[PDB]
From a paper:
Fatty-acid photodecarboxylase (FAP), together with protochlorophyllide oxidoreductase and DNA photolyases, is a member of the rare class of photoenzymes that require light to initiate each catalytic event. Absorption of a blue-light photon by the flavin adenine dinucleotide (FAD) cofactor within FAP triggers the decarboxylation of the fatty-acid substrate, which leads to the formation of a hydrocarbon molecule and CO2. The recently published high-resolution (1.8 Å) structure of FAP, determined from cryo-crystallo­graphic synchrotron data combined with UV–Vis absorbance spectra, revealed a bent oxidized FAD in the dark state. Forward electron transfer from the fatty-acid substrate to the photoexcited FAD occurs in 300 ps and is accompanied by concomitant decarboxylation of the latter, as shown by time-resolved visible and infrared (IR) absorption spectroscopies, respectively.
Numbering used by the authors: 77 to 305, 310 to 643
Write the structure that this text describes.
Amino acid sequence: SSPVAQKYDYILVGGGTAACVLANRLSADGSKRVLVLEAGPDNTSRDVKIPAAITRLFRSPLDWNLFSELQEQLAERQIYMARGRLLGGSSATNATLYHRGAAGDYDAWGVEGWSSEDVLSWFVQAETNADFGPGAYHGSGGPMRVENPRYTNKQLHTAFFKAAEEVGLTPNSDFNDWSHDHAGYGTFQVMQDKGTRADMYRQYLKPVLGRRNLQVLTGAAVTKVNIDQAQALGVEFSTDGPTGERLSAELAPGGEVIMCAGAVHTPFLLKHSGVGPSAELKEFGIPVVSNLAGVGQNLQDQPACLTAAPVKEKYDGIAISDHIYNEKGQIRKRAIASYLLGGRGGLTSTGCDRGAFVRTAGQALPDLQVRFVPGMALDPDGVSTYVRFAKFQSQGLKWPSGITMQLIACRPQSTGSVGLKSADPFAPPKLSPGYLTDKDGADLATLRKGIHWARDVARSSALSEYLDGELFPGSGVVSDDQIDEYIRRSIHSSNAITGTCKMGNAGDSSSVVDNQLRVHGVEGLRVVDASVVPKIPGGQTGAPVVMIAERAAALLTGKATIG
Ligand SMILES: Cc1cc2nc3c(=O)[nH]c(=O)nc-3n(C[C@H](O)[C@H](O)[C@H](O)COP(=O)(O)OP(=O)(O)OC[C@H]3O[C@@H](n4cnc5c(N)ncnc54)[C@H](O)[C@@H]3O)c2cc1C
Ligand SMILES: CCCCCCCCCCCCCCCCCC(=O)O
């Protein structure tokens, strides 16, 4: 009753990160009617705009609240996997860190037309950077806003860089400069606009919300993709939810459906639509249109553990939690003033924007990413500590001053999978991260060596001046076996998730889309989101998604070609 006798040249399944990019570029003429279905609500929450409010988005109504299956290798735990639920998707709920990884990450893709030389100009075209001048590696006319963090913890951040130098790291002045080595310590740039989150809704969708040929339905949960027998013809959805009407949106001649539901929901909606491994589809009675085995396989996510330690009493009050909460847990008006009046202060921080890439054992590229947080974790699950920090407000307690180092296997070898658990297209998918399952135990070894690394850093002269012992994992965790166990019981997502409908060369019986993002053996069906990533780059994945999305968009409108 919203697409009534209307036909669309492009239907966008999901209004997330890549979705926002595509709607902008494809609607930019006027001949193409574009439809954007988003299951979550509109992007208006003040928790979304303030970076420090990321603490409130986890396990909120703006999150899918996805929980993984039992992981037997993780002490029989279910792993919470944050995913954004609103216009702009995860770019509106994320830590705002801006990373491209290394050039070799894209060369390792092996896919024709998507080498590092091919992708570079698209990163740059999308970017306006407040702190690097225009060059081969940075842009100034682009829709993204990228800036150095506008919060510095004068004492703890400098101690961290002194400690990294003391144990033998060198600085990296730009982790996204492919002209030098990825490894090193420094400051991560952030996808922010003078301290306001610069998510893809704000940067791409919101400016073009006036075009008459662009229709953006929120509260619109898609259930399947109409594939008449093979050629897609539209989608089915519901504006109320599981207890609503089954609306249908038709496509114009030549109209294409583009999946933008993310690496969790795109392979899931594809399986409900008959695109998947037949054995899995038969088990729920779904007709097989395309029998591609890679739909849902190859899920890559970057697991994390942490160390945490308090400052000496002589340094009580210098952590970021002391810049946000007062001793009774209410937000300090000084922090509120600095944010609103100047875009400065603790409120501009997602907390984990300084760090390092380290090779734990002479790998071709760093296997370890370090995120230093000048606040003290109180749960070894770093996501849980963020949730706990939100609910700590006004509770009348003083959050203790300290530091945390989060350790991330950033180029992991373990792969996971996404599947069906019900025939209910509104049921949660069958989600298995598969952390620590690679046959060599390289991911466990990366994280275990990360713990040793962080302890050496904590023991340096520069940090030992500030620190007073260690809370996590603590004095009791001494042997490699104990470290390994501590990791199994605390490991959490650094929140990537890529690879579940991967792209590849013709004759890749393992891939799902071709180097032009069309799914094999279906007409008018393309995937443009984090699913198509064949091998996760080092670092956080939001920026490469935007790059894939800009490049797709230009390909569809004949501005560029691939191969
Ligand atoms: C908590 C968190 C922290 C992160 N931190 C960072 C970081 O610091 N830096 C960074 O670069 N990356 C980060 N990431 C990752 C980055 O945000 C994502 O990798 C990227 O945004 C993925 O883009 P996408 O378009 O593939 O998916 P999304 O942006 O998630 O888009 C998918 C969209 O599809 C919608 N959808 C799903 N199912 C349906 C349906 N049935 N009907 C309609 N709509 C549907 C969803 O609601 C969502 O809006 C973070 C991720 C999260 C979750
Ligand atoms: C932004 C406000 C800072 C709050 C500080 C809380 C104390 C520090 C806990 C650190 C835990 C490790 C970092 C986990 C980061 C999770 C965010 C993400 O992965 O998207």
